[PDB]
Write a protein that binds this DNA or RNA. Sequence first.
DNA 1: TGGAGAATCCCGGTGCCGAGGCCGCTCAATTGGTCGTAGCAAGCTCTAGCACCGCTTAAACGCACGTACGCGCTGTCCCCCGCGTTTTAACCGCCAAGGGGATTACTCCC
Length: 59
Amino acid sequence: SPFHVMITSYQLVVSDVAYFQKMKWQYMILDEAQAIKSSQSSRWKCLLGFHCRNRLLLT
DNA sequence: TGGAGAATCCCGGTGCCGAGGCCGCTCAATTGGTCGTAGCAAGCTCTAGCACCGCTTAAACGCACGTACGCGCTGTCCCCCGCGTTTTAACCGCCAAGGGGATTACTCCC
C-alpha cells in the first residue's frame, strides 16, 4: 500500500471532515489528547465520529 | 494579362486538459392533511364611452416661382498607413506576507 500510517493536524481532520468520513481506520492515535478535552469543540465532535476499530490517547 | 511573393488555408500529427459519466449522500422536493381566505361568481349602480347633428374658421392643399443649398468636380497637401528598427513591459513562476475569519482555551461574572 502507498501508506501504512497517516500523520495529520488537529486542524485538517475538522476541515477535511467530509473526506475523513467515507474512510475507515484500523487504529488511531491522538498525539496530545488534551486537545480533545472540550466536548463542545468541533475537534471533539468530529474525531469522535471517525470509524476506527481501536483508539489510543496520548497525554 | 502575368507574375512574383506575400498571406490565408489545409492537411495530418501531437498532447493536454477539460467534458461527460460514475459514485456517495443530503437535503430539498414530494406525499398527506389541515384551514383560512381571496377572488370567482352573481348582482346592482351610473360613469363615460360611442354615435350623430350642425356650425365656425383655422388648418391643410395645390400651385407659382424665386434662390438658397445639395452634390459632383477639381486641386492640394498633410497626415495617417504599411513596413523595418529599437526597446520596454506584459507575461510567467515562484516565494512572502498578512489578514481575516473560524475555532479553542481559560476566567470572571452571574
